[PDB]
Design a protein around this ligand. Structure first.
Ligand SMILES: CCCCCCCCCCCCCC(=O)OC[C@H](COP(=O)(O)OCC(O)COP(=O)(O)OC[C@@H](COC(=O)CCCCCCCCCCCCC)OC(=O)CCCCCCCCCCCCC)OC(=O)CCCCCCCCCCCCC
Ligand code: BCL
Ligand code: BCL
Ligand SMILES: CC[C@H]1c2cc3[nH]c4c(c3C)C(=O)[C@H](C(=O)OC)c4c3nc(cc4[nH]c(cc(n2)[C@@H]1C)c(C(C)=O)c4C)[C@@H](C)[C@@H]3CCC(=O)OC/C=C(\C)CCC[C@H](C)CCC[C@H](C)CCCC(C)C
Ligand SMILES: CC[C@H]1c2cc3[nH]c4c(c3C)C(=O)[C@H](C(=O)OC)c4c3nc(cc4[nH]c(cc(n2)[C@@H]1C)c(C(C)=O)c4C)[C@@H](C)[C@@H]3CCC(=O)OC/C=C(\C)CCC[C@H](C)CCC[C@H](C)CCCC(C)C
Ligand SMILES: *[C@H]1O[C@H](CO)[C@@H](O[C@@H]2O[C@@H](C)[C@H](O)[C@@H](O)[C@H]2O)[C@H](O)[C@@H]1O[C@H]1O[C@H](C(=O)O)[C@@H](O[C@H]2O[C@H](CO)[C@@H](O)[C@H](O)[C@H]2NC(C)=O)[C@H](OC(C)=O)[C@H]1OC(C)=O
Ligand SMILES: *[C@H]1O[C@H](CO)[C@@H](O[C@@H]2O[C@@H](C)[C@H](O)[C@@H](O)[C@H]2O)[C@H](O)[C@@H]1O[C@H]1O[C@H](C(=O)O)[C@@H](O[C@H]2O[C@H](CO)[C@@H](O)[C@H](O)[C@H]2NC(C)=O)[C@H](OC(C)=O)[C@H]1OC(C)=O
Ligand SMILES: COC(C)(C)C/C=C/C(C)=C/C=C/C(C=O)=C/C=C/C(C)=C/C=C/C=C(C)/C=C/C=C(\C)CC/C=C(C)/C=C/C=C(\C)C(=O)O
Ligand SMILES: COC(C)(C)C/C=C/C(C)=C/C=C/C(C=O)=C/C=C/C(C)=C/C=C/C=C(C)/C=C/C=C(\C)CC/C=C(C)/C=C/C=C(\C)C(=O)O
Ligand SMILES: COC(C)(C)C/C=C/C(C)=C/C=C/C(C)=C/C=C/C(C)=C/C=C\C=C(C)\C=C\C=C(C)\C=C\C=C(C)\C=C\CC(C)(C)OC
Ligand SMILES: CCCCCCCCCCCCO[C@@H]1O[C@H](CO)[C@@H](O[C@H]2O[C@H](CO)[C@@H](O)[C@H](O)[C@H]2O)[C@H](O)[C@H]1O
Ligand SMILES: [Fe+3]
Lengths: 62, 336, 39, 273, 299, 103, 71, 60, 59, 39
């Protein structure tokens, strides 16, 4: 009985909340290299703060 | 004139061709490796042995029978004429059931073969998913590929569920090259212009973004391939100047960058979201919204244009038509 | 590279080939003109 | 601010025009001469878009519509409120996109990179230039361009398609679509493969190019290899834009009938006429 | 490669018609040169001598003779009164052999049909109108003749069917519209036929962001809809019941009479004969008391 | 009400009783475009909703020679209006078929 | 100007020359075959006075127009 | 003249020539076959006076 | 005459020939597309018979 | 490698060839004008 609110609109805002969540996650992943930034005012992290640098386990011998 | 890395002048060959490393049970590698000179000039040269297992073998049997039913119905529809089967091929169709059957089983010629081909094709696609999933596990890899493929299967399945939700198999996609494009156009006509479906618009943005990203990423890796940038796993585990320069190019160009790993996450999501937002847009169509342009008028998407015509009140009554009904099932004489 | 001796010899085959072609082409044009003039 | 490794890369040189004059950064961004011309055209074009919104019927983002002139104006500039504004914005767009590609070339030269990125972007600029310059010029009026508005340009796409009754039957469009779809499939496979070797299940060692190569070869039957998949992705993505440019430039200037009746040549091949 | 374009909608919408300039000049010249010139108009007085005239009862003898000359050039060739008549005995509806002059029988019904078109369907043909030439072009057979074939032939929209709408006039789905996507495919087939019949594209009658919309569409869509109503009257009341008049060689495989469709008049042009106006010159065919203010002669 | 009053003294528009120096025009947005308020307002400018379908009460099957082999809905427009090969035309319908004891 | 044979490999100049002449020949033939006047495969046996000539000026009737009315 | 077969490989030029003649001959036959005048498979038995001729100049 | 020091004849000659070949081909097709100079179809018309474009209407 | 002799000699051919071409084209325009003047 809500006239303006309809399921297609509800779905679309559900997607927007997921999508803006996804962009945040990807921008955290993008900062695992090269961060924190150098600046004349000291280190800078940008936003969001980056995920930490990964360490990779090599194949033990072969 | 500077070497563009688009073509390889000098290939090398190994007398042995590499095999599969591990987990040979419940299935085995067919064939053996051979080299293609043309494929070796586009990219890597070995045309390989191949893996099926139980799921792969069954997938091919189901999928062969599906394709065989489609082709034999196409060929029957030109009266078995093999010249017309080739000449008319892109116009030929195996066509869904008639609308008045709803979800009931239809007659064999009138869509009963269609539903049977659609069932075997669907099972074949699911078994092929199981194959890919099992093979990723057996190679000790992440499951990123089967979830990417699941997103495509999701869109495909909406061409079953949306006909189910509107209550008639007649709304399904005909198997045929031009016929399924006729369906695609008519679907947008029936539901009042799919451009105003916002999940269709999202799906397009991700389809275009996938082309943007693979153009950008493909060009980026070729621009640093002179420095080993194409050895991406090595650049991810042991960042070289090739990774540093590709990060700096995009940072200096557009103000932010990815990493050599995380660019592949951007790629993965843009591809996956194309078919996922697409599927949602189909499932909403005819179930929640029946005229997307009018939904766009309601929600403020539709740009105003000056009127091209104005109806008088009696024309508003005269120019309404009828909804389309059944075809006439007789050949009237007009003799009296 | 190319000597003048070959360069001069070769030019003689070019001229005779060219003249033969132009002679045939001009006969072909005059035949076409007789059949259906374009001015 | 700079990446932790960036400073040693920030040398002078590699410009095409201007030399040292603009050879500096602003935050993350490289400026350069084509940076200055980029900002000029971006700013002028964007403010003229806002002016187009102001004199139109609404500020609603989806509904703003800066339309080209009537066809009667031909190749002249129309009155600014009658589509001449769309023409000035189009010149700014061409200037901004061209400046962007040349700035990319200056950046790539400064980093010792190949010119692949500027030329790949040239594919997109070609499609835009086809839509607003080449096809309208061949038709003899700028009014054949598409309008600048988030949904009104989709109305243009709809109507141009139905000018040919059934635009799916356009043969170059079928190729262009096939490239776009094949590109998206290839991008999902490339992303998945790199991620699945670099992020294996917990406690598994990091994968290798050999595992990637083996798995891919079970998918397509052949190994594409590392440089091959990036060549393919570039071929597919840029070919999609090039075939798009072809499919729209043949629609109108060269073919005027419905697209389904173009296929009459296939039905009349002498082996089966 | 030169293309002419006609704008038919608002400047940004790409509602436009495209014509291959060279190919259109050939079509237009091939109409203009055969286009038969009307004889001079004239009328002396006198009461009607006719023995067996049922339609042309409202017309002077000179205007009648003028009409018969026109009918012969438009249907049969300019002196070919033998096409319809037993030339010795014009009042006869039969040959000396006794067999019916089926051509004269048809032509009488075609006169009634033409008056019915020009008179009752002016909402379609306006002040251009039709004459025999509009369909016949100087030949006994018009173009676009169609017959019974299959139940789902879309040309039956011009005979016994009704209703082509498929779009919902609301946002949400409802019991009011249960059209199939197959029915949208059928309307799309029908509309391609209409577009080709006029040599126009969909934007001539629609803004394709809403095919359903009348306000966004050009006024030609209203005229088009009256053409559908006109064909149903023409086919049902005049052309189809000629079945027992024709020789069997003219009938379909179902033995049905030939029927008309949009292309029968339009022949691929936006107006028949590119808008040539002839009906005004032949009051015999008006079915109207005046044509664009020119009053009917009325003896 | 298409225009403001004009002063007879000087041929000059009066707005709210007071003169305007210049040639007064009524301001409008681009080409007089006006934003659509509502679905109801858009629908109020349209024809009425279509009448209900005419559906057949029962189905009579056609003679087999009137039944198309091809079930694709658009093929009459997309192929058959341009294709007129005789053998391809003959294949469009099922051939005649009669019980053997009726020959 | 026989020094032109010093500037290039003569084998390659003949390959380029043969290509240019062959392509230009086919261009002119198919142009003529597309014309009305020189459609020789259909109308080659017509006499020179019978062969088509492009009109100096088409006529018109004032109510007729080749193009629909525009906006 | 004959020294051209030092400048070019005979074995190779012959393949190029034979391929060119095959293509040329097939093109000319198919162009004729689709004409009206020379659709010889349908109308080849007509006499030369009886065979089609393209439309002439005479006009109003 | 020293301009030929700055540009290689092996390049210049082809560049000049390519320019002239394009320019000549452009002018011929522009004329052939005109009505007055569509000489394949109408070249046998006399100079008074050949088409002329529309004049000023004066009204 | 250019020399002032090579340059000066080549200049003569380019000048004379250009002028000869312009002469032949001037006759072609004379013929074209006599057939159908454009002013
Ligand atoms: C349609 C479907 C597909 C659509 C697909 C769209 C995909 C878009 C993806 C890219 C968007 C992010 C771009 C980016 O990260 O730029 C770097 C910049 C700064 O962070 P940093 O790089 O890590 O650190 C550097 C900085 O800290 C210090 O640098 P410096 O001192 O040298 O320079 C000065 C500063 C000043 O800061 C700014 O000016 C930032 C202004 C950012 C405005 C644009 C935001 C757009 C968000 C779009 C997502 C969505 C927003 C709703 O830094 C700079 O100068 C950095 C300049 C960066 C210029 C980036 C311009 C990107 C414009 C993109 C427009 C996209 C329009 C679609 O980041 C930010 O400022 C924050 C961005 C956060 C990610 C967006 C997440 C939004 C989630 C929803 C809201 C969350 C609210 C809490
Ligand atoms: C007139 C036509 C309509 C229209 C009608 C539709 C319809 C209808 C649909 C789309 C859909 C899509 N449209 Mg749209 N579309 C139009 C205009 C456009 C324009 C444009 C520039 O105008 C663009 C760019 C697009 C773009 C898109 C895509 C973003 C989207 C499809 C995503 C995808 O990957 O599909 C391709 C991917 C798949 C189909 C997945 C298939 C995966 C399966 C598993 C493969 C099986 C293969 C099997 C194993 C073997 C088969 C063997 C054979 C049977 C023999 N449309 C207009 C408005 N469009 C779809 C969508 O999502 O809509 C919301 C959709 O259904
Ligand atoms: C290497 C020789 C010189 C030269 C030396 C001469 C001499 C010497 C004479 C002419 C003459 C003429 N020259 Mg020359 N001329 C040259 C190049 C040209 C070019 C050019 C495109 O480069 C052109 C258009 C001309 C044009 C002309 C005419 C104005 C005139 C009449 C002949 C003719 O039409 O020849 C067209 C040009 C050619 C076919 C090529 C040039 C060489 C040929 C052999 C013609 C000129 C020589 C002529 C037959 C000599 C006759 C005997 C003398 C009267 C004593 N010359 C070259 C560079 N020219 C005559 C003159 O002045 O008459 C009033 C004349 O006596
Ligand atoms: C993220 C969205 C994009 C996407 C993703 C995607 N698609 C994918 C994947 C991914 C990530 C896969 O991993 C999967 C794949 O395998 O890729 C190679 C697939 C796939 N995408 C496919 C197609 C496809 N993807 C499309 C689109 C897209 N895919 C999107 C753009 C489209 C479009 C645009 O329409 C198509 C047509 C397939 C090539 C493949 C899935 C193959 C599959 O399921 O096959 C099932 C088997 C059959 C149909 C039977 C074939 C039978 C043969 C005739 C052989 C018969 C042999 C013998 C006679 C029988 C056996 C006898 C026994 C005794 C042996
Ligand atoms: C050729 C293959 C595909 C491709 C590739 C590609 N695009 C690229 C690149 C590459 C390789 C870049 O390097 C470049 C880049 O830097 O990306 C980050 C870019 C890029 N592709 C972009 C977008 C984009 N690409 C698209 C398409 C494609 N890009 C192709 C499918 C699309 C589509 C289909 O819609 C869009 C929107 C940008 C993010 C970026 C180019 C950025 C640029 O040029 O920046 C300078 C200009 C501005 C920031 C703004 C200019 C504003 C104007 C002056 C005024 C507005 C006028 C405009 C015409 C109005 C339009 C309104 C619409 C609603 C119609
Ligand atoms: C043959 O029959 C079919 C089925 O009725 C007719 O098609 C009908 O009309 C179309 C609009 C529609 O597309 C289709 O779904 C269907 O509704 C078809 O046109 C032919 O019609 C003639 O025969 C009809 C018939 O069914 O017998 C007949 O219908 C009338 O008579 C029957 C039997 O007495 C009665 O049940 C019907 O109610 C009655 N219908 C009407 C509308 O009066 C048609 O007669 C008339 C007047 O319609 C026949 O039509 C003609 C012109 O002869
Ligand atoms: C064709 O036949 C019709 C009659 O079928 C003739 O129409 C005449 O004029 C009408 C105004 C009137 O309504 C009608 O009754 C009739 O008088 C028409 O003129 C043509 O006539 C020729 O063919 C006639 C025919 O039907 O065969 C033939 O008629 C005679 O022979 C038939 C057959 O044996 C017989 O049934 C008739 O009664 C007979 N009629 C007469 C008047 O003799 C005509 O022969 C004669 C002599 O009239 C034919 O006409 C002529 C001039 O020969
Ligand atoms: C209609 O509308 C449009 C189309 C628009 C209108 C416009 C058209 C236009 C612009 C046309 C332009 C035309 C043109 C312009 O220049 C045309 C120019 C044509 C030319 C240059 C033709 C030249 C031909 C030369 C030939 C064939 C030479 C052959 C030589 C042979 C065979 C000998 C080979 C060597 C031998 C045998 C032995 C060597 C021995 C050796 C080495 C030894 O013994 O050692
Ligand atoms: C119709 O509508 C639109 C189109 C719109 C209207 C507008 C049109 C416009 C804008 C037109 C512009 C025209 C134009 C502008 O510049 C035109 C310019 C034309 C020019 C420059 C022509 C020049 C030609 C030169 C030639 C042919 C040279 C020949 C030389 C020869 C033969 C000798 C070769 C030398 C050798 C071999 C060396 C031997 C020695 C050696 C090697 C040694 O000694 O080493
Ligand atoms: C002799 O062998 C021959 C020569 C015949 C072999 C050659 C065959 C040839 C030439 C085949 C050609 C095939 C072509 C050209 C096929 C074209 C296919 C295209 C373009 C298809 C496009 C789209 C189709 C779609 C989206 C179909 C979707 C269908 C679905 C999702 C159906 C699902 C059905 C289900 C799940 C049914 C379930 C069964 C019920 C409902 C009864 O119970 C659960
Ligand atoms: C006396 C005769 C002796 C035998 C002659 C043999 C003739 C063989 C065929 C000649 C024509 C082939 O066609 C001609 O091929 C040359 C080959 O470089 C092409 O030449 C061009 O394209 C090729 C690639 O295709 C490039 O490598 C080359 O640099 C470029 O000049 C011409 O664009 C084309 O027109
Ligand atoms: Fe990569």
């Amino acid at each position: 009985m809500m006239e303006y609110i309809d399921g297609a609109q509800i779905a679309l805002y559900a997607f927007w909340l997921f999508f803006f969540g996804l962009i945040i996650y990807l921008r955290r992943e993008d900062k695992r290299e090269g961060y924190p930034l150098e600046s004349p005012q000291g280190p800078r992290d940008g936003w969001p703060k980056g995920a930490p640098k990964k360490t990779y386990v090599h194949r033990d011998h072969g | 004139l500077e070497y563009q890395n688009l073509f390889t002048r000098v290939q090398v060959r190994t007398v042995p061709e590499p095999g599969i490393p591990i987990d040979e049970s419940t299935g085995t590698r067919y064939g053996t490796g051979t080299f293609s000179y043309l494929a070796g000039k586009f990219g890597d040269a070995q045309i390989g042995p191949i893996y099926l297992g139980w799921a792969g073998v069954l997938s091919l049997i189901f999928g062969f029978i599906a394709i065989e039913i489609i082709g034999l119905n196409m060929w029957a529809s030109v009266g078995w004429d093999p010249v017309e089967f080739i000449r008319q091929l892109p116009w030929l169709a195996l066509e869904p059931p008639p609308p008045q059957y709803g979800l009931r089983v239809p007659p064999l010629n009138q869509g009963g073969w269609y539903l049977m081909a659609g069932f075997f094709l669907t099972v074949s696609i699911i078994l092929w998913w199981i194959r890919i999933y099992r093979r990723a596990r057996a190679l000790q890899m992440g499951s990123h590929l089967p979830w990417a493929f699941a997103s495509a299967i999701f869109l495909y399945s909406t061409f079953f569920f949306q006909p189910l939700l509107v209550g008639s198999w007649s709304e399904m996609v005909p198997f045929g090259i031009f016929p399924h494009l006729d369906w695609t156009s008519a679907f947008s006509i029936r539901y009042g212009n799919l451009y105003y479906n916002p999940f269709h618009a999202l799906s397009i943005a991700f389809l275009y973004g996938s082309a943007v990203l693979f153009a950008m990423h493909g060009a980026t890796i070729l621009a640093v391939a002179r420095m080993g940038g194409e050895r991406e796993i090595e650049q991810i585990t042991d960042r070289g100047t090739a990774a540093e320069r590709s990060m700096l190019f995009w940072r200096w160009c557009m103000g932010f960058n990815a990493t050599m790993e995380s660019i592949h996450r951007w790629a993965w999501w843009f591809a996956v979201l194309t078919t996922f937002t697409g599927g949602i847009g189909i499932l909403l169509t005819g179930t929640v919204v029946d005229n997307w342009y009018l939904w766009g008028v309601k929600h403020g998407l539709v740009a105003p244009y000056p009127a091209q015509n104005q109806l008088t009140p009696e024309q508003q009554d005269l120019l309404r038509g009828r909804y389309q009904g059944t075809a006439p099932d007789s050949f009237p004489s007009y003799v009296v | 590279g190319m000597t003048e001796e070959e360069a001069r010899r070769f030019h003689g085959y070019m001229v005779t080939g060219t003249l033969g072609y132009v002679v045939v082409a001009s006969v072909a044009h005059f035949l076409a003109w007789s059949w259906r003039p374009w001015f | 601010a700079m990446l932790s490794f960036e400073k040693k890369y920030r040398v002078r040189g590699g410009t095409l025009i201007g030399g040292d004059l603009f050879d500096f950064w602003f935050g993350p961004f490289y400026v350069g001469f084509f940076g200055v011309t980029t900002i000029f055209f971006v700013t002028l074009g964007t403010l003229l878009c806002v002016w187009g919104a102001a004199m139109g019927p609404t500020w609603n983002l989806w509904q703003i519509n800066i339309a080209p002139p009537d066809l009667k104006y031909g190749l002249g500039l129309a009155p600014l409120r009658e589509g001449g504004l769309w023409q000035i914005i189009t010149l700014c767009a061409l200037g901004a996109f061209g400046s962007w590609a040349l700035r990319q070339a200056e950046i790539a030269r400064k980093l010792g990179m190949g010119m692949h990125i500027p030329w790949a972007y040239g594919g997109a600029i070609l499609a835009y230039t086809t839509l607003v310059v080449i096809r309208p010029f061949l038709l003899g009026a700028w009014g054949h361009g598409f309008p600048y508005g988030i949904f009104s340009h989709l109305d243009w796409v709809s109507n141009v398609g139905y000018q040919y009754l059934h635009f799916h039957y356009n043969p170059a469009h079928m190729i262009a679509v096939t490239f776009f779809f094949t590109n998206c499939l290839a991008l999902a496979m490339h992303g998945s493969l790199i991620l699945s070797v670099t992020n294996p299940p917990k406690g598994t060692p990091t994968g290798t190019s050999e595992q990637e190569n083996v798995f891919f070869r079970d998918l397509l039957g052949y190994s594409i290899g590392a440089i091959g998949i990036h060549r393919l992705g570039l071929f597919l993505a840029v070919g999609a834009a090039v075939w798009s440019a072809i499919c729209i430039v043949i629609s109108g200037p060269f073919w005027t009938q419905g697209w389904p009746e173009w296929w009459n040549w296939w039905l009349n091949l002498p082996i089966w006429k | 490669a030169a293309t002419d374009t006609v704008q038919v909608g608002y400047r940004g919408t790409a509602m436009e018609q495209n014509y291959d300039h060279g190919d259109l000049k050939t079509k237009f010249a091939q109409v203009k040169l055969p286009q038969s010139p009307p004889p001079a108009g004239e009328s002396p007085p006198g009461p009607l001598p006719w023995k067996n005239v049922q339609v042309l009862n409202d017309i002077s003898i000179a205007e009648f003779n003028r009409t018969m000359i026109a009918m012969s050039t438009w249907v049969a060739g300019t002196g070919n009164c033998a096409y319809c008549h037993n030339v010795a005995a014009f009042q006869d509806d039969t040959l000396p052999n006794g067999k019916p002059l089926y051509t004269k029988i048809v032509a009488r019904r075609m006169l009634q049909m033409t008056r019915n078109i020009n008179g009752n369907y002016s909402q379609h043909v306006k002040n251009t109108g039709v004459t025999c030439y509009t369909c016949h072009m100087g030949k006994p057979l018009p173009n676009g003749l169609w017959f019974y074939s299959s139940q789902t032939d879309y040309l039956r929209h011009y005979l016994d069917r009704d209703g082509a709408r498929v779009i919902t006039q609301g946002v949400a789905p409802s019991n009011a519209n249960r059209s199939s996507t197959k029915q949208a495919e059928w309307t799309y087939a029908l509309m391609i036929s209409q577009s080709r019949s006029l040599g126009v594209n969909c934007t001539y009658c629609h803004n394709t962001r809403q095919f359903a919309s009348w306000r966004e569409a050009p006024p030609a869509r209203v005229t088009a809809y009256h053409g559908i109503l006109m064909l149903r009257d023409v086919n049902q009341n005049y052309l189809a019941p000629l079945q027992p008049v024709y020789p069997a060689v003219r009938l379909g495989a179902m033995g049905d009479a030939p029927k008309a469709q949009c292309v029968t008049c339009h022949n691929g042009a936006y107006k028949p004969l590119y808008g040539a106006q002839m009906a005004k010159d032949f009051p015999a065919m008006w079915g109207r008391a005046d044509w664009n203010g020119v009053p009917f002669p009325g003896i | 009400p298409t225009a403001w009053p004009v002063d007879p003294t000087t041929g000059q528009t009066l707005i709210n009783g007071r003169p305007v120096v210049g040639r007064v025009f009524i301001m409008r947005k681009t080409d007089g475009t006006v934003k659509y308020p509502n679905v109801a307002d858009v629908v109020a400018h349209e024809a009425l909703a279509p009448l209900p379908p005419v559906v057949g009460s029962s189905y009579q099957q056609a003679p087999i020679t009137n039944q198309r082999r091809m079930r694709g809905i658009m093929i009459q427009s997309t192929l058959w209006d341009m294709d007129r090969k005789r053998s391809a035309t003959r294949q469009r319908y099922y051939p005649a078929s009669t019980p053997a004891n009726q020959l | 100007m026989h020094r032109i044979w010093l500037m290039y490999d003569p084998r390659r100049v003949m390959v380029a020359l043969v290509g240019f002449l062959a392509v230009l020949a086919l261009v002119i033939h198919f142009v003529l075959l597309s014309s009305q006047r020189y459609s020789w495969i259909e109308n080659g046996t017509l006499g020179a006075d019978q062969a088509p000539v492009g009109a100096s000026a088409p006529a018109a009737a004032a109510e007729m127009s080749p193009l629909p009315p525009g906006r």
